[PDB]
Design a protein around this nucleic acid. Structure first.
Ligand SMILES: Cc1cn([C@H]2C[C@H](O)[C@@H](COP(=O)(O)OP(=O)(O)OP(=O)(O)O)O2)c(=O)[nH]c1=O
Ligand code: SF4
Ligand SMILES: [Zn+2]
Lengths: 66, 1010
DNA sequence: TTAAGCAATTCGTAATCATGGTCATAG
DNA sequence: CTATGACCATGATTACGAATTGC
């Protein structure tokens, strides 16, 4: 923790995985894996050792009335 | 980056200098030629080199009458006035003045105020060494000691104490933004070892210069250099940025030469490594010290003339200065032209009854000129919101996210830089499109004040300047009268209306430039005001003086010519030339900006008259003001008597006309015919007929024909506008009504405009009633956007708003938990909406910020908006066409439509389902009721045509943001509170969320797993 | 040391007056 | 238990002070 919260914030702004501020984080991870762009096997291995926490399993701007 | 061209081959003993000045400056100096105040003048050549000019040998002075004794006509006492008193008790009278070369001079002059005769009198001219010694001398010659050998017994008053640079410019006939010439052999370039940073540095004596009056070929403008910039900072969540914790991360700059239709420089300086942008240079640094140093070096090397931006004074420059002070970078705050001078932040305030009161900071830059476009908008224009988005929509047509666009990758930083460059580009487009700078240069050339005074001062320095420039040509001196305080006088008359609705044409006749032509054609001035005794015992009344309705006597023009007639005549010809230029444009926005130019010149001419009556001012003469408004009242009642008396049934005409209205310059006479051609013909005959009963330039003129007409009260009416006949109609006129004020809701102003449209153009009251019914019904059914509900009010001086409790003051002074660092200040506008509660004693307890009621979802008081905002303007407008059954008609059109309303313990809802047909709560989830089950195909048919229309509204809105943003492949981030698009795109998601779930009460129309 | 003017319509806010409704006491 | 009187408040209307616009 506090290092796992920057890896996800770095996965969320890389443009080669998609334009993602409307959906979940694991849905975008599986969308890129289907098309197989290059999802890395570390943004998966922190979404498995946690429960349904809203500060891991949510996009950066899931507040913010946009 | 790009440098100025190289000054090749100037030789001073053969060649002159011809350059155009921008700024002047005062400077107390050593290195005297073998006075101490020497003058600086900065400017540009006809090619593009930068020229500093040092001017020597000038010292301030004033005048004082020589008292009638044996002293000031005897040279021993003149030089004894120069000589100091060596006594011990004269330490209060010869120290703070001390040994200064005040000197003694004898001259024969006159005082301005009044008319005593054509004969002058001896005055003493007193020079002083320094400009910062005329204040203690004034404190030592009037209330100080003037016992000096009995030469000047106390007291003799001081006359013509004015400003130093203004006295220089009045002396040598140099005006703002003028062409200046140093002749051959008069100036020395290498006499001044370089202390400033310009290219050419001359060193001249103050009698060598030649001033060219701007006219003919001397009416050009040199190629100046204009810069605009913008900055970005990275803040915390909630917390507004603070110059001791939040770094400056990006600076972006645009630069152009004036006269060329595109820029030539486009630079962006960032603080992490970035990605390239086509059309601009990009440099990157790993520390902020390098970024601030790089910007200071660029601003020294490019060396711009003018610096613009948007809110750069109150946000950008002091943020940069404080941030450079915190990080210990010594070389930043030297931004000016003088090589050894650092810059400093200093507060200032301005207040008037015309613009209100505003408090600004200033930052010192010598040589360079500042033009914040926000202050120009706030001074000239009266708008509803003053945000960059709001004025860019009105004229053209468009913090915590940024901190994670900067802590991310380099394409995010490239997106941030493109956003910042668009921000830094918008005020240039506004400056060149609105004709700001051309009008500022013409104002400085017509009035004679510098170019920095049109952003800091009011309308007094300009009329003082023009009066002094006209006073040197006949030899008069101005006095100092100051009084606190006189009384008011009686203003203008308004004629009593015949209120109602008219449907026969009324023609408008008015006088053009009324008060300046009264002051012109009856020879009224300070310098020809006759005191009550000095007529006596001469008895010549006829054609030597006249008498006014307030009571004064004023000398005819066969003896004197006043000074205010000539200043007014110059201003009137300048406005006439501006209108003659405006009569040949075809573009609409260009036509209104030339209208803005001529409006400004008419405001200047009327502020000449308003100077006289200002008892808190510099020279008031309320006798003149009273004579002006007395002549106004007399002439308008003359107009009304004459118009209603001549064209009558016995005088061969058709119908005796009757005046329905008149307001101090205009007359709205109702003629009787219902043919617009015959009304126009008789109205032109009437205007030209009545004008032949006056001196000149007094003239009445036809202006319009209203058909139909609607008169509600004093200063409240409406009508439809005819300019010609085959030019059928132009537009509506809404004088005073609820559509042009800014104290209300957009909903109410829109309803008033649409009602007058349906009522005056199509003449259908039934569509008007149906329209107002639909507006009220959609209000009560909760389908009206919250853009239409926002009220704005101006937060003025804090003590008047201490005196009585208001709504906007209560919202402003109540801070937020998120941000006690961004809140309304004095002078701005506070927006709010009114929510529903049960505290009926106070409408100042129900007000809330629009963004707070957005994010926290508070309900709206529809009864407040129904009975307090809407109802009474409608009862103003709709009554005069009918009786009081019309009040009952709209309150009954409410009554058929008021019966349809839509809406701790509130969380414990049981999700009670309800029948879609007859609204009966019941156990189970099926949509239809057992009594209303047969009619189910019709109840499914009903409401799927509602889902169908919500689907069509989702798609038109959420793809409009993609075209306003620019991109089709990346996310939208725009929470622009002045866009209707925002929060209208938020509610359709919830309407669709609700209406989709109501149709799943019905089963599915098929399987889905096959 | 520094500052154009006044006439207002108009609506809001506050205060005062009127009118009824509720509670308590007495018969 | 019922009726009458008193008090109390609450609501509505009228009069005054204040942002903006017409000149
Ligand atoms: C607008 C305005 C008018 N007035 C006075 C002076 C004017 O002589 C008188 C008439 O008002 P206006 O009709 O507004 O101005 P005007 O008649 O001088 O010029 P024009 O007809 O070309 O539009 O009202 C002022 O004193 N100060 C002002 O700001
Ligand atoms: S909400 Fe959409 S349409 Fe409205 S300003 Fe923002 S981007 Fe433009
Ligand atoms: Zn039912």
């Amino acid at each position: 923790e506090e290092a796992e919260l920057e890896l996800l914030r770095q996965f969320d702004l890389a443009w080669q995985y998609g334009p993602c501020t409307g959906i979940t984080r694991l849905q975008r991870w599986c969308r890129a894996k289907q098309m197989g762009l290059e999802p890395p096997p570390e943004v998966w291995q922190v979404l498995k050792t946690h429960p349904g926490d809203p500060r891991f399993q949510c996009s950066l701007w899931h507040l913010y009335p946009l | 980056r790009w440098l100025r061209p190289t000054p090749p081959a100037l030789d001073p003993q053969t060649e002159p200098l011809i350059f155009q000045q921008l700024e002047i400056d005062h400077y107390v100096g050593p290195a005297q030629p073998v006075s101490v105040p020497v003058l600086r003048a900065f400017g540009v050549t006809d090619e593009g080199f930068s020229v500093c000019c040092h001017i020597h040998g000038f010292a301030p002075y004033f005048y004082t009458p020589a008292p009638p004794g044996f002293g000031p006509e005897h040279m021993g006492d003149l030089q004894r006035e120069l000589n100091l008193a060596i006594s011990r008790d004269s330490r209060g009278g010869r120290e703070l003045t001390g040994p200064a070369v005040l000197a003694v001079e004898l001259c024969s002059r006159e005082s301005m105020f009044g008319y005593h005769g054509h004969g002058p009198s001896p005055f003493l001219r007193i020079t002083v060494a320094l400009p910062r010694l005329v204040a203690p001398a004034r404190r030592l010659l009037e209330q100080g000691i003037r016992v000096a050998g009995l030469g000047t017994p106390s007291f003799a008053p001081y006359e013509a104490n004015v400003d130093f640079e203004i006295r220089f410019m009045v002396d040598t006939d140099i005006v703002g933004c003028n062409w200046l010439e140093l002749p051959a052999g008069k100036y020395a370039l290498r006499l001044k070892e370089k202390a400033t940073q310009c290219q050419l540095e001359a060193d001249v004596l103050w009698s060598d210069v030649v001033s060219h009056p701007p006219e003919g070929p001397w009416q050009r403008i040199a190629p100046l250099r204009v810069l605009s910039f913008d900055i970005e900072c990275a803040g915390r969540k909630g917390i507004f940025p603070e110059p001791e914790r939040d770094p400056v991360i990006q600076i972006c700059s645009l630069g152009l030469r004036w006269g060329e239709p595109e820029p030539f420089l486009r630079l962006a300086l960032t603080l992490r490594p970035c990605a390239p942008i086509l059309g601009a240079k990009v440099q990157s640094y790993e520390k902020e010290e390098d970024l601030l140093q790089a910007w200071s070096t660029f601003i020294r090397i490019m060396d711009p003339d003018v610096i613009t931006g948007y809110n750069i004074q109150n946000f950008d420059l002091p943020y940069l200065i404080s941030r450079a002070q915190t990080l210990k970078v010594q070389t930043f705050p030297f931004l000016g032209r003088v090589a050894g001078l650092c810059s400093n932040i200093r507060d200032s305030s301005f207040q008037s009854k015309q613009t209100g009161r505003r408090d600004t900071k200033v930052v010192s830059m010598v040589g360079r000129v500042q033009m914040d476009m926000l202050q120009v908008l706030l001074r000239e224009y009266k708008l509803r919101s003053y945000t960059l988005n709001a004025v860019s929509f009105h004229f053209l047509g468009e913090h915590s996210i940024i901190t994670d666009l900067q802590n991310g990758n380099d394409q995010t930083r490239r997106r941030l830089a493109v956003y910042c460059l668009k921000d830094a580009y918008l005020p240039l487009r506004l400056l060149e499109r609105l004709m700001v700078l051309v009008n500022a240069v013409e104002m400085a050339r017509v009035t004679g004040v510098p170019l920095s005074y049109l952003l800091s001062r009011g309308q007094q320095v300009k009329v003082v300047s023009q009066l002094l420039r006209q006073a040197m040509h006949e030899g008069l001196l101005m006095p100092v009268v100051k009084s606190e305080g006189g009384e008011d006088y009686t203003g203008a008359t308004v004629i009593e209306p015949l209120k109602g609705y008219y449907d026969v044409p009324i023609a408008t006749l008015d006088f053009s430039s009324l008060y300046p032509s009264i002051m012109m054609a009856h020879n009224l001035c300070y310098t020809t005001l006759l005191r009550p005794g000095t007529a006596q015992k001469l008895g010549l009344t006829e054609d030597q003086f006249i008498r006014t309705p307030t009571g004064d006597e004023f000398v005819k023009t066969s003896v004197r010519k006043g000074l205010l007639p000539q200043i007014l005549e110059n201003l009137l010809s300048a406005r006439k030339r501006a209108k003659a230029e405006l009569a040949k444009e075809t573009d609409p926005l260009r036509r209104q900006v030339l209208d803005g130019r001529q409006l400004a010149l008419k405001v200047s001419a009327n502020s000449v008259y308003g100077f006289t009556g200002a008892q808190v001012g510099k020279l008031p003469c309320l006798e003149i003001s009273q004579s002006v408004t007395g002549f106004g009242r007399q002439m308008i009642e003359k107009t009304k008597q004459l118009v209603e008396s001549k064209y009558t049934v016995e005088n061969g005409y058709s119908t005796s006309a009757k005046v329905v209205y008149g307001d101090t310059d205009s007359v709205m006479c109702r003629f009787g015919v219902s043919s617009v051609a015959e009304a126009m013909a008789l109205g032109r005959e009437a205007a030209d007929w009545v004008s032949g009963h006056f001196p000149s330039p007094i003239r009445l003129e036809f202006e319009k024909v209203y058909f139909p007409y609607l008169l509600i009260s004093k200063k409240r009416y409406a009508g439809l506008l005819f300019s010609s006949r085959p030019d059928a109609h132009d537009r509506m006129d809404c004088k005073g009504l609820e559509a042009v004020r800014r104290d209300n809701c957009p909903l109410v102003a829109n309803l008033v405009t649409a009602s007058l449209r349906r009522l005056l153009i199509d003449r259908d009251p039934e569509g008007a009633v149906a329209h107002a019914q639909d507006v009220i019904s959609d209000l009560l059914c909760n389908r009206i956007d919250i853009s239409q509900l926002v009220i704005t009010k101006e937060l003025t001086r804090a003590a008047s708003d201490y005196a009585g409790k208001q709504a906007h003051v209560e919202l402003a002074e109540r801070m937020r938990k998120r941000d006690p660092g961004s809140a309304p200040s004095l002078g701005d506008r506070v927006p709010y909406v009114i929510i529903s509660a049960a505290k009926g004693v106070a409408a100042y307890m129900k007000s809330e910020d629009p963004l707070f009621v957005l994010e926290h979802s508070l309900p709206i008081d529809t009864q407040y908006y129904l009975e307090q905002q809407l109802a009474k303007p409608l009862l103003r407008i709709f009554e005069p066409i009918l009786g009081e059954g019309r009040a009952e008609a709209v309150l009954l059109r409410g009554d058929h439509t008021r019966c349809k309303t839509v809406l701790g313990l509130l969380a414990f809802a049981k999700r009670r389902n309800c029948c879609i047909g007859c609204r009966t709560v019941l156990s189970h989830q099926g949509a239809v009721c057992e009594f209303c089950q047969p009619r189910e195909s019709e109840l499914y048919q009903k409401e799927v045509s509602h889902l169908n229309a919500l689907e069509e509204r989702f798609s038109r809105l959420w793809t409009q943001c993609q075209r306003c943003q620019g991109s089709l492949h990346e996310d939208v981030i725009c929470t622009s509170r002045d866009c209707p698009i925002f929060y209208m795109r938020k509610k359709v998601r919830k309407d669709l969320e609700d209406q989709e779930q109501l149709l799943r009460r019905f089963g599915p129309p098929g399987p889905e797993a096959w």
